[PDB]
Structure formats: structure tokens, C-alpha cells
Design a protein around this nucleic acid. Structure first.
Ligand SMILES: [Mg+2]
Ligand SMILES: [Mg+2]
Ligand SMILES: [Mg+2]
Ligand SMILES: [Mg+2]
Ligand SMILES: [Mg+2]
Ligand SMILES: [Mg+2]
Ligand SMILES: [Mg+2]
Ligand SMILES: [Mg+2]
Ligand SMILES: [Mg+2]
Length: 224
RNA sequence: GCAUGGUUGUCGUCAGCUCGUGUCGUGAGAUGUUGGGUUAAGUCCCGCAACGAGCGCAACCCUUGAUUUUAGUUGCCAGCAU
């Protein structure tokens, strides 16, 4: 239920190129400007409503969602929305096998929390060099890749991606695992493998925040 | 010793040889173990559909180079003379 004035004032309608686009996205097209394709805003507001209603149904029983923002233009936007809405996200590289190999990756998560109590209850250092360096250097890398996904317990119930052309592993890893997928698609992205596509621009920083925070408002609406 | 246990040599103290769970391939198989740097070394980092681990490397062991305590003879001789 976003008015076109907000979408237009962000920069959502912009596209990538006339040379770099997916023919499957033809129906979500409105006029060719000077070298750029433009999304039909009338379609976007209709599309965003279905995703607006759907992702509170998945969160109707205090469910769980995932936010994928590895792109450099949406690292904080997913973090800002997930933290504010009390959910989960990923910002650094998507480690292959996060979902299909959830059994193995979870063993890595408990290892990072294992060292957490070392500086919380146990001895600060075991050796002057090994514990101070080898044990501590692991935490910086281990908590950079996993980070704010450590509080999950089981497989997610819905997935949020911003650029399915870049985040391809996540997409393929969710279809094999049969998880509903919602996300924003550019002019060169492929809508066939997504469930609840949202035609919009994602390179424009002022355009990502409009949708990513709006989606965060639907899940926050029912968990009360 | 071109039938064998053994016991050995040289490549070589070179840095390699693999496994589990995932993923790609109809399939034998592949990835991890390739790419950019770095190191004595798949040593270590960064980047990637991989995430980890085992035998190898390094470490544990012996000897030399500084030092504390302990025990002072058959070793040592400053304080004392002989
Ligand atoms: Mg023989
Ligand atoms: Mg002979
Ligand atoms: Mg020789
Ligand atoms: Mg197969
Ligand atoms: Mg090899
Ligand atoms: Mg060597
Ligand atoms: Mg050794
Ligand atoms: Mg020594
Ligand atoms: Mg002494």
C-alpha cells in the first residue's frame, strides 16, 4: 500500500540497460528512456501488496524469516530492518550450504559460541600467544560470516533477497529445499524461479530502504 | 632376493595423500585441494558451491647459548693463615 509518489521519489523505476536485460521481464516494462528501461509503477504497487499480505501469513505463528543483502548497496538496510524488526539476516558472503548443509554449519555456530564463554566465565587466555591470537582471530572471521544468524534454531520459513541475479546460491538452495521465496528483481533478473517477485530497482540506495523497511513492517505487525 | 618374511636403501625431511556432510555431472568423476599474494612448508591471509576434519608440515623430545632455587664432594679456594 505504497503510493507511487514514494516509489517515484526514491528512484525505484530506474533500470539497468537496453543491452543487459531478461526477456522474461518484458511484462514488467514501461517505456524506454535514454538508454534505460523503466518499471511499470502500476504493476509494482499491485505486486507489493501480495507480498505485503503473504509474509505476515508465514509469520502468523511467530515464524522466522531470512534477509539476504550481500550486495554492497543493501548491507545495512537488511541489517537495519532485521535488527529493528527482530529477525535474522546475512551481510557478508553467503556461505554455500547454509540451508542444505544446515547440520554441518550449525556445528560451526556452536564453536563460535563456545569461545564466547571463554572470555565471559572461563579464563581469558590459555597460552600467551595461542589463545590470545589463534583463538581470538577465529572469532573475528567466524562472527563476520555467520554473525546475526546465530540465534536461529531450525530451517527458515520464508526468504528475502534483494538481487537474485547476484545471490544465486540462496535462490537455488531454497528451491531445492522447497522454501517460499520473496524478493526484489531488477530489469535483468529472472522472475521464473521466484515466487512473490517485486519489480523494482535495487542499486538506488534510497530505493532499497523504502521496500526493505516496508516489508519489515508486515512481520512486526503480527508478532505482537 | 623374477616365489617370500624380514631388515634396508634412493626420490626426500621433498610437501604432499585422503575422509564426512553438502553441491555439479545420465556416468566413470569433479569441487573442497583451482585463482592473487606470502612462507622453510596445502604454512597463513584474501577471493570463490563449499563447510570442516585425519595422517604428513610446525609443536611436544635431546644438546648448545643467559639465569633462579636446591645439594656442596672426590670438584672449587675469595675471606684466614699454612
Ligand atoms: Mg623375495
Ligand atoms: Mg643380485
Ligand atoms: Mg644420499
Ligand atoms: Mg545429480
Ligand atoms: Mg593434491
Ligand atoms: Mg619442509
Ligand atoms: Mg615434525
Ligand atoms: Mg633450543
Ligand atoms: Mg643460582
Amino acid at each position: 500500500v505504497i503510493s507511487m509518489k514514494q516509489l517515484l521519489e526514491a528512484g525505484v523505476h530506474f533500470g539497468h540497460q537496453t543491452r543487459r536485460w531478461n526477456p522474461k521481464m518484458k511484462k514488467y516494462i514501461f517505456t524506454e528512456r535514454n538508454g534505460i528501461y523503466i518499471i511499470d509503477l502500476q504493476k509494482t504497487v499491485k505486486k507489493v501488496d501480495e507480498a505485503f499480505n503473504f509474509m505476515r501469513e508465514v509469520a502468523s505463528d511467530n515464524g522466522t524469516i531470512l534477509f539476504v543483502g550481500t550486495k554492497k548497496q543493501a548491507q545495512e538496510s537488511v541489517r537495519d530492518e532485521a535488527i529493528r524488526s527482530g529477525q535474522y539476516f546475512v551481510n557478508h558472503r553467503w556461505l554455500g550450504g547454509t540451508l542444505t548443509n544446515f547440520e554441518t554449519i550449525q556445528k560451526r555456530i556452536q564453536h563460535l559460541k563456545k569461545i564466547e564463554k571463554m572470555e565471559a566465565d572461563g579464563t581469558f587466555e590459555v597460552l600467551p600467544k595461542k589463545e590470545v591470537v589463534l583463538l581470538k582471530k577465529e572469532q573475528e572471521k567466524l562472527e563476520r560470516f555467520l554473525g546475526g544468524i546465530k540465534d536461529m534454531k531450525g530451517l527458515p520459513d520464508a526468504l528475502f533477497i534483494v538481487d537474485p541475479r547476484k545471490e544465486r546460491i540462496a535462490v537455488a538452495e531454497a528451491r531445492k529445499l522447497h522454501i517460499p521465496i520473496i524478493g526484489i528483481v531488477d530489469t535483468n533478473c529472472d522472475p521464473d524461479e521466484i515466487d512473490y517477485v517485486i519489480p523494482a530497482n535495487d542499486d538506488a540506495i534510497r530505493a532499497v530502504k523504502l521496500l526493505t523497511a516496508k516489508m519489515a513492517d508486515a512481520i512486526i505487525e503480527v508478532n505482537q
